[PDB]
Amino acid sequence: GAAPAGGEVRRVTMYAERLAGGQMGYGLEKGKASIPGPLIELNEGDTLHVEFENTMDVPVSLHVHGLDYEISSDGTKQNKSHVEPGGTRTYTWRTHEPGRRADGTWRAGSAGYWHYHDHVVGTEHGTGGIRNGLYGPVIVRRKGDVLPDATHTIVFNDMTINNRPAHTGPNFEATVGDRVEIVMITHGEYYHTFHMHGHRWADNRTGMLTGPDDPSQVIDNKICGPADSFGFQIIAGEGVGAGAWMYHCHVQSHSDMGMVGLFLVKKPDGTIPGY
Amino acid sequence: AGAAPAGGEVRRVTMYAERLAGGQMGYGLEKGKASIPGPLIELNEGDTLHVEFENTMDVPVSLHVHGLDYEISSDGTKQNKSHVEPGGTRTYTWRTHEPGRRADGTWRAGSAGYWHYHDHVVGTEHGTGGIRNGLYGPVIVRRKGDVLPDATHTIVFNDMTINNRPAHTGPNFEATVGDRVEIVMITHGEYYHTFHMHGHRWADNRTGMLTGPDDPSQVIDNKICGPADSFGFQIIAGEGVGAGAWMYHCHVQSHSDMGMVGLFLVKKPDGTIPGYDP
Amino acid sequence: AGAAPAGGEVRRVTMYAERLAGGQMGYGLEKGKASIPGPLIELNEGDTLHVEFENTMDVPVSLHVHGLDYEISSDGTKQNKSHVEPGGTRTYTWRTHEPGRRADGTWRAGSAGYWHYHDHVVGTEHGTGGIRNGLYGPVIVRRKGDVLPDATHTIVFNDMTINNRPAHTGPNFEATVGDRVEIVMITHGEYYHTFHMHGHRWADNRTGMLTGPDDPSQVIDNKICGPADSFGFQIIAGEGVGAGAWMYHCHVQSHSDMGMVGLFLVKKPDGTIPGYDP
Ligand SMILES: [Cl-]
Ligand SMILES: [Cl-]
Ligand SMILES: [Cu+2]
Ligand SMILES: [Cu+2]
Ligand SMILES: [Cu+2]
Ligand SMILES: [Cu+2]
Ligand SMILES: [Cu+2]
Ligand SMILES: [Cu+2]
Ligand SMILES: [Cu+2]
Ligand SMILES: [Cu+2]
Ligand SMILES: [Cu+2]
Ligand SMILES: [Cu+2]
Ligand SMILES: [Cu+2]
Ligand SMILES: [Cu+2]
Ligand code: NA
């Protein structure tokens, strides 16, 4: 599968909800909040109207990286684009294809691995909302982009992955030969280095070299900081086979404290060597 | 408007290091007009710049540049006695070169890029005091044919300040929708940071602009940088997003909460900014 | 210039983990000759390496490698029982592949790049103690046609040391003007760093040099890196700048002040260095 040319106007509902233990999450339905929030995927040219309701007892917002939006959808208290308790606001995100401007230069398209998060809970930069769990991934695809069999989102939020307790993953499963897409977001206060055992990717927009002429470094380890995002696709077990392949932050105190998960790659019969 | 010409010119400028109010120190092109950041120096690949440097201060100081060609006598360090004693003068010479094929068949990278200069001698033998006090500034070297901007703004994350300004006090920059704005970004000190701009994005490559449809550089609005990293880009003000008070800030959460924030004020051609109401 | 040939060879080498003077631990290819950093392993894309590994120590130890192809039985972790007990032996196998077209129409990336190996079992299940003690080394995988250097030097920022050495004790590296010098740069431990080289610059891409005039990679002399990052490049020693004691250092100000500094000693043909103290 490859991505089609975009151009459709889409609508979705989103809600901010309290979860257990002082956490907060986004969901596409009341009672369906999750951390991270739901994956939003768009084709370059698509417009998305996000009909957003704050079900909580404190103000909240939705702010997005990378996409086109007018100042009225900035999602900050500074611009009065936040949402009071019980309120509804329609946020509009737009995207565009690349193309040459009249001045002769190449205008970059929206395609990329992006993310949305809160900007008003706790402080006017969303520090409390982000810690509590108000973040989620946005994928914008260019026409012809290769589509994966599955997508997994890994968020290094301070000293946790996806706000989970230390040493509790998350784990992800695949079968040898699956095309697996990873979205990588970082939040909070610390720099991290994401590492994957047994797999590697290109350090460019799609995480895959375009061909023999792409000079991007091929890596299996990458430093990132708060609100960085990137993504890539790998063929699970390619050249290396089945197994319980760790991924972790490579800052030594961070892995030692439990910023680790498993990429569980099964043989076609469902078994996993040595696990 | 237009594009950078071919280089090759021999240029001179005078540069002064001066004390400023409040324990600051700055470079400038004239006495009593020092600034933090210091003056933007622009060269075209091939140009030579002779910097007639004068220390007006009562302590040693130096001038050390990233990226450009210099011989060891313009290194600007005490370690090889290229610093400037109090009250003294020295000529620092910087050269630039074009890219080109070597005799061995390999491709020699050119000098073009976003670079910077700073002190290497005040407080420690790595300029830790000078850098903290404000002795830093931007250097742009352009390749022949590089697109030229309508304006250029330099943003330096120096420890917990922007351009040595106190928390929450700017700087702010203004533009009109459609302006071609160049941003030069430099980091200094002890901390890593992540630079973010609302409403705008750039390419992670030499010029910040994709060269065309075959450039696979990631397009970003957020980038981690550490001490003495430099990069630059050009954006079209309000492109696809309209006028507004577009924030820029470090995205390390405690850093933005403690004032590492500024405003990119993008106006309509009639001067209006929608919903800007501070 | 000289160029890497096509790979495809199957090679074998012995490796040992040994305790070294002063509470350190190192890898080596011969008993009693372990070093920090460990020996440089060089492969052409397609080659296979069987490392016949022996642990001469009193604690379990492993060998884990970045970037290369390996099965789970050569992962080098306790978590899947591919560590080596005291006195034990194990054959670890590393494979590499060329780039090429896939049936789905995508371009599979090759193994070529600047990589590294290290312990994953000493002190903790992530090798924190082993890495601190010095169990790390560089791996270079070359693509057919890659330019070969006159010499290669490995610089490891391991916590607050370079190559586990005390502050202000190097290492220093020697070259003659015109030498083609390869640098492998690895980071380990707990802290981010920014590697900086006076007088020289390189391209932020796979090989550290631009393929030609269509490569838009930023040209840099300063780069932020974190634990287990690796990159490398090649430079012409003194090119456009001449002979001298060219410092390299972390540019985090407190780190360079504390001694994360070394010298790139570039000599004239007669072996002297204008302005230096041997
Ligand atoms: Cl302005
Ligand atoms: Cl690939
Ligand atoms: Cu913001
Ligand atoms: Cu981490
Ligand atoms: Cu690994
Ligand atoms: Cu953000
Ligand atoms: Cu220096
Ligand atoms: Cu910051
Ligand atoms: Cu934003
Ligand atoms: Cu510097
Ligand atoms: Cu690991
Ligand atoms: Cu450092
Ligand atoms: Cu320097
Ligand atoms: Cu590692
Ligand atoms: Na690149």
Of B113, B146, B179, the one marking the end of a domain is B146
Q: Are B169 and B259 in contact (CB under 8 A)?
A: yes
Same domain membership, residue C117 and residue C180: no
Q: How far is CA A54 from the centre of its chain?
A: 22
Resolution value, angstrom units: 2.0
Q: H-helix or E-strand containing B155?
A: strand B151-158
Cβ-based neighbours of A20, under 8 Å, separated by 6 or more: none
Read off the tokens for A102: 């009249």
Q: Are A51 and A26 in contact (CB under 8 A)?
A: no
| Long-range Cβ contacts of A73-78 (<8 Å, 24+ apart) | A74/B198, A74/B199, A74/B244, A75/A119, A75/A120, A76/A119, A76/A120, A76/A124, A76/B247, A77/A119, A77/A120, A77/A124, A78/A124, A78/B245, A78/B247
Residue type at C215 in one-letter notation: D
Q: Does C268 touch chain B (CB under 8 A)?
A: no
Q: How far apart are CA A233 and CA A19, in angstroms?
A: 31
Cα dihedral sign for C56, C58, C64, C69? positive
Q: What share of chain B is helix, strand, coil (3-state, %, to 5)?
A: 5, 40, 55
Dihedral over alpha carbons C261, C264, C270, C272 (to 10 degrees): -20
- Phi and psi of C258, rounded to 5°? -80, -10
Give the closest of C244, C252, C274 to B226, CB-based: C252
Residue C198 labelled as part of a binding site: yes
Q: Which of residues 32-91 of A touch C (CB under 8 A)?
A: none
CB contact under 8 A, C214 and B217: no
Same domain membership, residue C69 and residue C35: yes
Same domain membership, residue B21 and residue B53: yes
For chain B, what's the residue count?
A: 278
Same domain membership, residue C6 and residue C133: yes
- Return the ∠ at Cα B75 (arms to B70 and B78), rounded to 5°: 165
Q: What is the 3-state secondary structure (H, E, C) of chain A?
A: CECCCCCCEEEEEEEEEECHHHCEEEECCCCCCECCCCCEEEECCCEEEEEEEECCCCCECCEECCCECCHHHCCCCCCCCCECCCCEEEEEEECCCCEECCCCCEECCCCEEEEEECCCCCCCCCHHHHHHCCEEEEEEECCCCECCCEEEEEEEECCEECCCCCCCCCCEEEECCCEEEEEEEEECCCCEEEEECCCCEECCCCCCCCCCCCCCCEECEEEECCCCEEEEEEECCCCCCCEEEEEEECCHHHHHHCCEEEEEEECCCCCCCCC
CB contact under 8 A, C254 and B131: no
Subunits with at least 3 CB pairs below 8 A relative to chain B? A, C
CA atoms within 13 A on the CB side of A175: 6
Q: Does C232 touch chain A (CB under 8 A)?
A: no
Residue B168 labelled as part of a binding site: no
Q: How far apart are CA B210 and CA B203, in angstroms?
A: 6
Read off the tokens for C122: 């000493």
Chain A residues closer than 8 Å to B218 by CB: 112, 203-205, 230
Q: How far apart are CA B176 and CA B107, in angstroms?
A: 40
Q: Are A67 and A165 in contact (CB under 8 A)?
A: no
List residues bridging with C89 in a β-sheet.
C54
- Phi and psi of A191, rounded to 5°? -80, 155
Q: How far apart are CA B201 and CA B264, in angstroms?
A: 13
Q: How far is CA B182 from the centre of its chain?
A: 10
Q: What is the CATH number of the domain that holds A199?
A: 2.60.40.420
Q: How far apart are CA A143 and CA A219, in angstroms?
A: 26
Residue C18 CB neighbour total at 10 angstroms:
20
Residue C32 CB neighbour total at 10 angstroms:
8
Residue B83 labelled as part of a binding site: no
User: In a mutagenesis test of the A interface, which of C81, C98, C106 is the best target, namely the one with the most A β-carbons within 10 Å?
Assistant: C106
- Return the ∠ at Cα B5 (arms to B4 and B10), rounded to 5°: 115
Same domain membership, residue C211 and residue C200: yes
Segments in C30-138 forming alpha helices (H): 128-133
Closest CA to C36 of C196, C186, C150, C259: C186
Residue A28 CB neighbour total at 10 angstroms:
15
Residue C64 labelled as part of a binding site: yes
Same domain membership, residue C132 and residue C247: no
CB contact under 8 A, A69 and B199: yes
Give the closest of C80, C95, C124 to A244, CB-based: C80
Residue with tokens 């550490």: B226
Q: How far apart are CA A42 and CA A46, in angstroms?
A: 6
* DSSP 8-state assignment for residue B58: S
Same domain membership, residue A136 and residue A1: yes
Segments in B16-157 forming alpha helices (H): 128-133
In chain C, the residue whose alpha carbon lies closest to the alpha carbon of A245 is C72
Read off the tokens for A33: 């909040």
CB contact under 8 A, A225 and B257: no
Residue type at C273 in one-letter notation: I
Residue with tokens 């440089």: C40
- Return the ∠ at Cα B216 (arms to A45 and C156), rounded to 5°: 135
Q: How far apart are CA B252 and CA A226, in angstroms?
A: 5
- Phi and psi of B180, rounded to 5°? -95, 110
CA atoms within 13 A on the CB side of A47: 8
Q: How far apart are CA B114 and CA B142, in angstroms?
A: 9
Q: H-helix or E-strand containing C219?
A: strand C219-220
CB contact under 8 A, A218 and C112: yes
Q: Does B220 touch chain C (CB under 8 A)?
A: no
Q: How far apart are CA B196 and CA B202, in angstroms?
A: 11
Give the three-class secondary structure for C252: coil
Same domain membership, residue B181 and residue B138: no
List residues bridging with B180 in a β-sheet.
B236
Same domain membership, residue B122 and residue B22: yes
Cα distances (angstroms) measured from residue A254 to each of A163, A248, C160 = 14, 8, 17
Give the closest of A80, A107, A112 to B218, CB-based: A112
Q: How far apart are CA A215 and CA B215, in angstroms?
A: 10
Same domain membership, residue C158 and residue C142: no
Same domain membership, residue B7 and residue B137: yes
Q: Are C70 and C94 in contact (CB under 8 A)?
A: yes
Give the three-class secondary structure for B65: strand
Closest CA to C135 of C56, C199, C248: C56
Of A97, A126, A145, the one marking the end of a domain is A145
Residue B126 labelled as part of a binding site: no
- Phi and psi of C217, rounded to 5°? -55, 140
CB contact under 8 A, C229 and A223: yes
Read off the tokens for A172: 């992800």
Closest CA to B155 of B232, B218, B66: B232
Residue type at B116 in one-letter notation: H
| Strands of the A47-54 sheet, one edge to the other | A24-27, A9-18, A47-54, A88-94
Subunits with at least 3 CB pairs below 8 A relative to chain A? B, C
Give the closest of B218, B239, B275 to A230, CB-based: B218
Strands A243-249 and A192-196 turn out to be antiparallel
Q: Are B208 and B200 in contact (CB under 8 A)?
A: no
Q: Are A262 and A244 in contact (CB under 8 A)?
A: yes
Strands A172-175 and A260-266 turn out to be parallel
Q: How far apart are CA C242 and CA C266, in angstroms?
A: 8
Dihedral over alpha carbons C215, C220, C225, C229 (to 10 degrees): 40
Tell me the residue range of the domain where B164 lies: 147-278
Give the three-class secondary structure for B129: helix
Of A97, A118, A145, the one marking the end of a domain is A145
List residues bridging with C181 in a β-sheet.
C151, C235
Q: Is the peptide bond before A170 cis (omega within 30 degrees of 0)?
A: yes
Binding positions of A for Cu(2+) are 63, 65, 117, 119, 192, 195, 197, 248-250, 254
- Phi and psi of A72, rounded to 5°? -70, -15
Closest CA to B228 of B179, B186, B276, B191: B186
Q: How far apart are CA C41 and CA C136, in angstroms?
A: 12
Q: Are A95 and A44 in contact (CB under 8 A)?
A: yes
Give the three-class secondary structure for B73: helix
Chain A residues closer than 8 Å to B213 by CB: 98, 106
CB contact under 8 A, B209 and A106: yes
Total domains, chain B: 2
Same domain membership, residue C194 and residue C62: no
- Return the ∠ at Cα B224 (arms to B206 and A184), rounded to 5°: 105
Q: Which ligand is nearest to the CA of A226?
A: 6
Subunits with at least 3 CB pairs below 8 A relative to chain C? A, B
Strands C193-197 and C222-225 turn out to be antiparallel
Give the three-class secondary structure for B72: helix
